[PDB]
Amino acid sequence: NAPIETDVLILGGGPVGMALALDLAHRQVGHLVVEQTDGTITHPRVGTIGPRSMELFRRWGVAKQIRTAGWPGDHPLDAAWVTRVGGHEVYRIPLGTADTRATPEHTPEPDAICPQHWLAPLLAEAVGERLRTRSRLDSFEQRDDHVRATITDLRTGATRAVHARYLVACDGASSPTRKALGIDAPPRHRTQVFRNILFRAPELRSLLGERAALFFFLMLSSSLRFPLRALDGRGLYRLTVGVDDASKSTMDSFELVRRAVAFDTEIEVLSDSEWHLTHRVADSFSAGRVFLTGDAAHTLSPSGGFGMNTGIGSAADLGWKLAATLRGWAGPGLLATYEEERRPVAITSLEERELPPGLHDDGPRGERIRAAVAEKLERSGARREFDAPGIHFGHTYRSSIVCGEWRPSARPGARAPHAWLTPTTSTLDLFGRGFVLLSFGTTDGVEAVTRAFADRHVPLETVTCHAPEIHALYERAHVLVRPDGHVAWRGDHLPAELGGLVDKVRGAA
């Protein structure tokens, strides 16, 4: 069989690889995803989806299916520090429910909960035929204008040759592609080992009632503290305990869960495995026509789903730069800006106690003791870890393709702010294709910008907005937004040399 040709070969069908596939599909770029496994999920590793990631899934047309995948609209989203699930509570941060939560002001897409066993199937359905499961990329050989990859269909043992213009490795933290390329990714922190116990407790939610929660942090003893999370809000829970220097023995999985649950109820352990997390960032995000994205480029903190959200955001960044180069309007230096703009996000993120006696006491004394701990927890800004839009929306690119000059801002490099145009359409819904020039009030000079972009064959759409509130939000009369939704330039007056502007934002300067 002759070699199969495609513009982009995506190695790895994990969350990031599928996000990239969705962005390329959205941009009408030919691609193929090879996944060595069968796509099945036996122990969900991800579930929390940040609001920015959802804005991206919105753009890619799957936000609806994600939000309706099964998480209960009436399940509490609270985070609670307790001596035992169903026992004395120390500190609880009320976060409402999916159905009662107040509409977010800075985004059309609040965060979502979609465990991997629901997420994988949905993404695979959206990507369709382009996803090849049970397919293993064995090796790749770069050529001058393309990359040759050898893939083994694990069902037939037959090997196929795939010639792609670009190979994007979304093959995870231990990325064999990164190693093959000779790119180093030195550890940025000691390795953290986590023991994950996935269990099913059918009646636990009923026993908890409104005292149920998404996140439970157990304070069983000074030597035993760990999170226990509602995974699907329908019976599945995941206890994650650290196996550190304090870990002396390996307690029985069932006994650990029973110890963490105050109720005498049905508990069935489904899986008991470990995760060795080593924060690493690739020294380089590409070599020739081979790129690294997701954990392969940056294995980061899973706190608040930061690592996965960053991976999805990096996939969206590379997606538009690849499409622009493939279509021919990108400057030769555009692809290099993927590392320039995304590597700093990863780097910056990495740069970033005992229990009082009687804490589990029933009397009014223990209640007072728990109260005290609650104060320390709150003052330590523990509640800010559940209300920090800046972490999700605040990164601002200061790069070679951005013309320089938490609260939403349209400053160059930042994510253009959300505002409703209609009850169903946000300013964000205007972004994601090509460049967009938003003009508030006057349109003088806009025709000139239009021609400047056409001369370079750079896609541009111009939109005239008459809403004074949105103008106030954006602060300037004209705002040029990039294909990724970030601002490239703004001002009350269009620049004199538009040729220079067009070349700068497309990576040609």
- Site residues for Cl ion per CB under 5 A: 165
Shortest distance, position 7 Cβ to Cl ion, whole Å: 8
Contact present, 415 and 59 (Cβ < 8 Å): no
269 labeled binding residue: no
CB closer to ligand FAD out of 197 and 438 = 197
Residue matched to tokens 């750079």:
458
Residue 153 CA: distances (Å) to CA of 144, 147, 172, 377: 26, 19, 20, 52
Q: Which of 29, 85, 308, 416: binder of ligand FAD (CB under 6 A)?
A: 308
Q: Residue 76 binds which entry of ligand FAD, Cl ion, none, with Cβ cut-offs from 5 to 8 Å by kind?
A: none
143 labeled binding residue: no
Nearest-angstrom CA–CA distance, 429 and 423 = 12
Contact present, 123 and 57 (Cβ < 8 Å): no
Nearest-angstrom CA–CA distance, 370 and 218 = 13
Q: Report residue 506 CA to chain centroid gap.
A: 25
Site string for ligand FAD, 145-184 (x = CB under 6 A): -------------------------xxxx--x--------
For position 137 contacting ligand FAD by CB under 6 A, the verdict is yes
Q: Residue 50 binds which entry of Cl ion, ligand FAD, none, with Cβ cut-offs from 5 to 8 Å by kind?
A: none
Shortest distance, position 328 Cβ to Cl ion, whole Å: 8
Q: Residue 295 binds which entry of ligand FAD, Cl ion, none, with Cβ cut-offs from 5 to 8 Å by kind?
A: ligand FAD
Nearest-angstrom CA–CA distance, 484 and 392 = 15
Shortest distance, position 75 Cβ to ligand FAD, whole Å: 19
Shortest distance, position 19 Cβ to ligand FAD, whole Å: 8
Residue matched to tokens 């509640």:
383
For position 23 contacting ligand FAD by CB under 6 A, the verdict is no
Residue matched to tokens 């229990």:
355
Shortest distance, position 324 Cβ to Cl ion, whole Å: 10
37 labeled binding residue: no
CB closer to Cl ion out of 148 and 205 = 148
Give the nearest residue (CB) to Cl ion.
Answer: 165
CB closer to ligand FAD out of 238 and 418 = 238
CB closer to Cl ion out of 182 and 332 = 332
Nearest-angstrom CA–CA distance, 260 and 227 = 10
* Token code pair at residue 248: 């002396």
Q: Residue 183 binds which entry of Cl ion, ligand FAD, none, with Cβ cut-offs from 5 to 8 Å by kind?
A: none
Beta strand segments in 201-297, E: 215-221, 224-230, 236-242, 268-277, 280-281, 286-287, 290-292
Q: Which of 10, 13, 471, 483: binder of ligand FAD (CB under 6 A)?
A: 13
For position 16 contacting ligand FAD by CB under 6 A, the verdict is yes
Question: Interhelix angle for 116-127 vs 15-26, to 10°?
Answer: 30
- For residue 206, the tally of other CB atoms under 10 A from its CB is 11
Q: Which of 51, 76, 86, 307: binder of ligand FAD (CB under 6 A)?
A: 307
Nearest-angstrom CA–CA distance, 485 and 477 = 18
Site string for ligand FAD, 373-412 (x = CB under 6 A): ----------------------------------------
Nearest-angstrom CA–CA distance, 316 and 433 = 11
Shortest distance, position 10 Cβ to ligand FAD, whole Å: 9
Strand order in the sheet with 192-200: 89-93, 79-82, 215-221, 224-230, 236-242, 192-200, 268-277
Shortest distance, position 152 Cβ to ligand FAD, whole Å: 9
Q: Which of 232, 272, 295, 339: binder of ligand FAD (CB under 6 A)?
A: 295
209 labeled binding residue: no
For position 227 contacting ligand FAD by CB under 6 A, the verdict is no
Nearest-angstrom CA–CA distance, 407 and 230 = 31
Half-sphere exposure of residue 290: CA atoms within 13 angstroms, side-chain side = 24
- Tell me which residues in 179-218 interact with ligand FAD (CB under 6 A): 196
Residue type, 328: G
Q: Residue 399 binds which entry of ligand FAD, Cl ion, none, with Cβ cut-offs from 5 to 8 Å by kind?
A: none
Residue matched to tokens 């801002």:
409
Task: Give Cβ neighbours of residue 424 (< 8 Å, ≥ 6 apart).
Answer: none
Q: What is the DSSP letter of 478?
A: E
295 labeled binding residue: yes
CB closer to Cl ion out of 214 and 330 = 330
Q: Which of 23, 35, 111, 339: binder of ligand FAD (CB under 6 A)?
A: 35
Q: Residue 265 binds which entry of Cl ion, ligand FAD, none, with Cβ cut-offs from 5 to 8 Å by kind?
A: none
Residues near ligand FAD (CB under 6 A), total: 31
Q: Report residue 177 CA to chain centroid gap.
A: 21
Select from 79, 57, 78, 59 the least CA-distant residue to 68.
57
Q: What is the DSSP letter of 122?
A: H
283 labeled binding residue: no
End-to-end Cα spacing for the chain: 43
Residues making contact with ligand FAD (CB under 6 A):
11-17, 34-37, 45-46, 136-137, 170-173, 176, 196, 273, 275, 294-296, 302, 305, 307-308, 311
Q: Which residues are annotated as a binding site for FAD?
A: 16, 35-36, 45, 47-48, 137, 238, 275, 295, 308-309
